[PDB]
RNA sequence: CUUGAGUCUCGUAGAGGGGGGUAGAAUUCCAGGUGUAGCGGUGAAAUGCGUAGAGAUCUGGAGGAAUACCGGUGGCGAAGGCGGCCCCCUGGACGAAGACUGACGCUCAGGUGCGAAAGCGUGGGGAGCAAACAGGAUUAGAUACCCUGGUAGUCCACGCCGUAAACGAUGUCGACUUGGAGGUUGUGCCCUUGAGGCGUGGCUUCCGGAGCUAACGCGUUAAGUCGACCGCCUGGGGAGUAC
């Protein structure tokens, strides 16, 4: 498989869904013969610019390792989900853990 | 390019011994794979020329090797062209 | 570019931001573009910067 | 007769002319000036000391309220990016923040070929 | 440096305009300059850092 | 047989290519608020736009093209060319311990393929720019330069056309031959205590010695000393024209 690192920022007034969103994704990854060696909840915070309006959003990281196939399934559930304002996921670059 | 679990795999199928990544029988066969595999890639995109240049490279480069075998051991040639379904 | 100071006075601080953009990358546009004229004059003016 | 108290002032600094409008906080026109309308026209304007007399004319149309303080919005290059702010500092107005709102793209549209003599 | 979360060690390589500081006044071994800029770009999407300044 | 050439391993840098996403700045336009007699343009002017309310300003929306800064005397590519961030498919280059094959190589008429821009066909798209065209100005005249507009086109797909000062105006491959300063990227090593210091490869700038050259100049990336193969020249015009 190939490592990853996805940081999704969900709408500020939908934070309560963030915790639930994590379980789904995480569960899938685990059920995809993958691994999760990084995780952190940044919560709400001011933005550089009012990206997609407002001036704050909920941040979360990841840095998985699951097979590209199953992660490509994420872009869909990510797009078709007004909760999440912006999506941004880079490639492997070898397992990343702690710090951040 | 090609995956190790495949490259280091095939080498142990045509090599007249062990870890003989040099052997024509090996190298040559190793070329067909990356070639056949790319044919599915070039089926898409098409306009991607800079990648075909390398494709053609390994193709002619493969032929340069086939001619050699014929000029070093007639048998080995016809004995390998089959295992690779070459000539077409 | 963002100024702001206590104690009313028209000192300046303004020409501080006048070193990153300002009337430069402005007139840079102004008229037409460049295309080949730059890649060339940009690589000739470089020769100047030698001595 | 509204008494905006404080409102930013846009300084459309251009070459062939310069104009400053003392708009309100939200961005409503309260009083605008103009070099072309400042006696001298043709092209005699432009020059800084010519725009200063223009924007200063606002303190005659926007003075009906009582602007006790105001910011400054300088846009575009030309002889009127400094002059304006100066004349305003003497007119009696205050100041809250100076800034350049000149439209600096990222290689978007392709500017006009133009000029070639 | 190869990231964007390290927003802490980036505000130094910019200015009141959030513009990527040149390598002239940095001499950041070049190879690093390349990486340093790449971060400031992608990092701006996560609103971690600003693009311009007027907005 | 192994040093040429190639394979394997593990790393490294890259605007190499094809596909799909996505972001921010700006322009234009549509709508509405504020506000009022100018705006725009030039050397001046005028056409043009303005009291049916422009310009300015602010809020919301639509759309297309290109990606400031980083950006460099930088990098990648056979050439043409290739700059936002992200993912997917993919090519080449280089270094190092090495392990492997064993001359499998160099060049290449004909042949096949790739080719800036402009142009062509079908269908899309169209913000800005702009051949044509139309006004205004300049002038002796002005079928121009300048100004106000503006259509093809520029953008996308797919197919065609094959040209360029397609330029290093310098064919590809290999071996030799004083030096100096620098750039970029790999690797070994050094109280690795450091920005760092010493080597050893790749690519690349500038100066320059011998030599070469008609001179300018080229000068280890040669236009120097040699070897292998290919393309080409034989006065100017007529003519890259006629058939």
Place of tokens 């490279």: B57
Which chain C residue is nearest to residue E19, measuring alpha carbons?
C20
Sheet holding A8-10, edge to edge: A41-46, A56-60, A8-10, A84-86
Do D87 and D52 contact (CB within 8 A), yes or no? yes
Cα distance between residue A42 and residue E8, in whole Å: 15
Domain interval for residue B56: 1-88
Count of beta carbons in the 10 Å neighbourhood of residue C48 = 7
Q: How many residues does chain B have?
A: 88
Do A25 and A46 contact (CB within 8 A), yes or no? no
Beta-strand pair A41-46/D72-75: unpaired
Which chain D residue is nearest to residue C35, measuring alpha carbons?
D110
Dihedral through CA E16, CA E17, CA E20, CA E26, nearest 10?
-40
Contact D89 C1 (CB under 8 A): no
**DSSP for E5-55, written as a single string:** S-GGGTTTSS-TT-PPPPSTTT--TTHHHHHHHHHHHHHHHTTSS-S-S--
How far does C22 lie from chain E, in Å, by closest CA? 12
CA atom of D85 to C1′ atom of F171, Å: 66
Cα distance between residue D78 and residue D76, in whole Å: 7
**Can you list the pairs that B46-51 forms with residues at least 24 positions away whose Cβ atoms lie under 8 Å?**
none
Total count of domains within chain C: 1
Question: Which of D94, D69, D62, D97 shows the shortest CA–CA distance to D5?
Answer: D69
Helices and strands, number each (H, E), in chain B: 4, 0
| Strand F at less than 7 A from CB of D11 | no
Domain interval for residue C32: 1-51
DSSP state of D69: B
Q: Positive or negative CA dihedral for D92, D3, D13, D47?
A: negative
Which pair of tokens denotes residue B50?
Answer: 């800079």
Structure obtained using? cryo-EM
Q: Which nucleotide lies at the shortest CA–C1' distance from A50?
A: F24
Cα distance between residue D24 and residue D3, in whole Å: 10
Question: Which of C35, E41, E49 shows the shortest CA–CA distance to D107?
Answer: C35
Dihedral through CA A73, CA A77, CA A78, CA A82, nearest 10?
170
Cα distance between residue D76 and residue C21, in whole Å: 11
- List CB contacts of D97: < 8 A, sequence separation 6 or more: C2, C3, C4, D71, D72
- List CB contacts of B84: < 8 A, sequence separation 6 or more: B28, B29, B32
What is the distance in angstroms between the CA of the first residue and the CA of the last residue of chain D?
Answer: 53
Q: Do chains D and A touch (3 or more CB pairs under 8 A)?
A: no
| Cα dist from C38 to A5, B47, C35, C46, whole Å | 40, 30, 6, 11
Contact E16 C1 (CB under 8 A): yes
Which pair of tokens denotes residue D59?
Answer: 């303190």
Q: At how many Å resolution was this determined?
A: 7.6
Burial bucket for residue B74 (CB in 10 Å: 0-12, 13-18, 19+): exposed
Contact A48 E45 (CB under 8 A): no
Contact E16 C2 (CB under 8 A): yes
Q: Spell out a b/e string for A60-97, using b for 16 or more CB atoms within 10 Å of the CB, else e.
A: bbbbbbbeeebbeebeeebeebebbbbeebeeeeeebe
Do E40 and E11 contact (CB within 8 A), yes or no? no
Cα distance between residue B10 and residue D74, in whole Å: 70
Total count of domains within chain E: 1
Q: Do chains E and C touch (3 or more CB pairs under 8 A)?
A: yes
Q: Is A52 left (phi over 0), alpha (psi -120 to 50) or beta?
A: left
Question: Which of D85, D94, D97, D26 shows the shortest CA–CA distance to D66?
Answer: D94
Place of tokens 């005659």: D60
| Cα dist from A75 to A68, A89, E3, whole Å | 11, 9, 21
Q: Is D39 left (phi over 0), alpha (psi -120 to 50) or beta?
A: left
- Tell me the three state secondary structure of residue C26: coil
- List CB contacts of C41: < 8 A, sequence separation 6 or more: none
Beta-strand pair D72-75/D98-100: parallel
Q: Is B18 left (phi over 0), alpha (psi -120 to 50) or beta?
A: beta
Spacing of C-alpha D11 from chain mean position: 2
Report the alpha-carbon angle E33-E35-E36, nearest 5.
60
Beta-strand pair A84-86/A4-6: unpaired
Domain interval for residue E53: 1-55
CA atom of B27 to C1′ atom of F2, Å: 19
Q: How many residues does chain A have?
A: 100
| Cα dist from A57 to A10, A84, C37, D21, E28, whole Å | 6, 9, 46, 37, 34
Question: Which of A31, A21, A20, A34 shows the shortest CA–CA distance to A63?
Answer: A34
Q: Is D99 on the interface with C (CB under 8 A)?
A: yes
Spacing of C-alpha E3 from chain mean position: 10
């Amino acid at each position: 498989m190939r490592h990853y690192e996805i940081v999704f920022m969900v709408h500020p007034d939908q934070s309560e869904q963030v915790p639930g969103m994590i379980e789904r994704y995480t569960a899938a990854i685990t059920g995809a013969e993958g691994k999760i060696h990084r995780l952190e909840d940044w919560g709400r915070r001011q933005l550089a610019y009012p990206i997609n309006k407002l001036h704050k959003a909920h941040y979360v990281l990841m840095n998985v390792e699951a097979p590209q196939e199953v992660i490509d399934e994420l872009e869909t559930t990510f797009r078709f989900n007004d909760a999440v304002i912006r999506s941004m996921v880079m490639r492997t670059k070898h397992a990343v853990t702690e710090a951040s | 390019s090609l995956s190790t679990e495949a490259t280091a795999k095939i080498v142990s199928e045509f090599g007249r011994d062990a870890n003989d990544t040099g052997s024509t029988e090996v190298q040559v066969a190793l070329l067909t794979a990356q070639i056949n595999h790319l044919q599915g890639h070039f089926a898409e995109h098409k306009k991607d020329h800079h990648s075909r240049r390398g494709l053609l490279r390994m193709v002619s480069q493969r032929r340069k090797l086939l001619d050699y075998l014929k000029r070093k051991d007639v048998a080995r040639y016809t004995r390998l062209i089959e295992r690779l379904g070459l000539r077409r | 570019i963002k100024v702001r100071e206590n104690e009313p006075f028209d000192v300046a601080l303004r020409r501080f931001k006048r070193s990153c953009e300002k009337a430069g990358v402005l007139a840079e546009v102004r008229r037409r573009e460049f295309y080949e004229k730059p890649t060339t004059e940009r690589k000739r003016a470089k020769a100047s910067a030698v001595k | 007769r509204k008494q905006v108290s404080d409102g930013v002032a846009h300084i459309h600094a251009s070459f062939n002319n310069t104009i400053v409008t003392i708009t309100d906080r939200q961005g409503n026109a309260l009083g605008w000036a103009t070099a072309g309308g400042s006696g001298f026209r043709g092209s005699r304007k432009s020059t800084p000391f010519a725009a200063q007399v223009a924007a200063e004319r606002c303190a005659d149309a926007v003075k009906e309220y009582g602007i006790k303080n105001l910011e400054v919005m300088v846009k575009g290059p030309g002889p009127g990016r400094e002059s304006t702010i100066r004349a305003l500092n003497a007119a009696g107005f205050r100041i809250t923040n100076i800034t350049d709102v000149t439209p600096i793209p990222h290689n978007g549209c392709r500017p006009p070929k133009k000029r070639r003599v | 440096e190869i990231d964007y979360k390290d927003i802490a060690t980036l505000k130094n390589y910019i200015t009141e305009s959030g513009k990527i500081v040149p390598s002239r006044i940095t001499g950041t071994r070049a190879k690093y300059q390349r990486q340093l800029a790449r971060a400031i770009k992608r990092a701006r999407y996560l609103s971690l850092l600003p693009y311009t300044d007027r907005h």
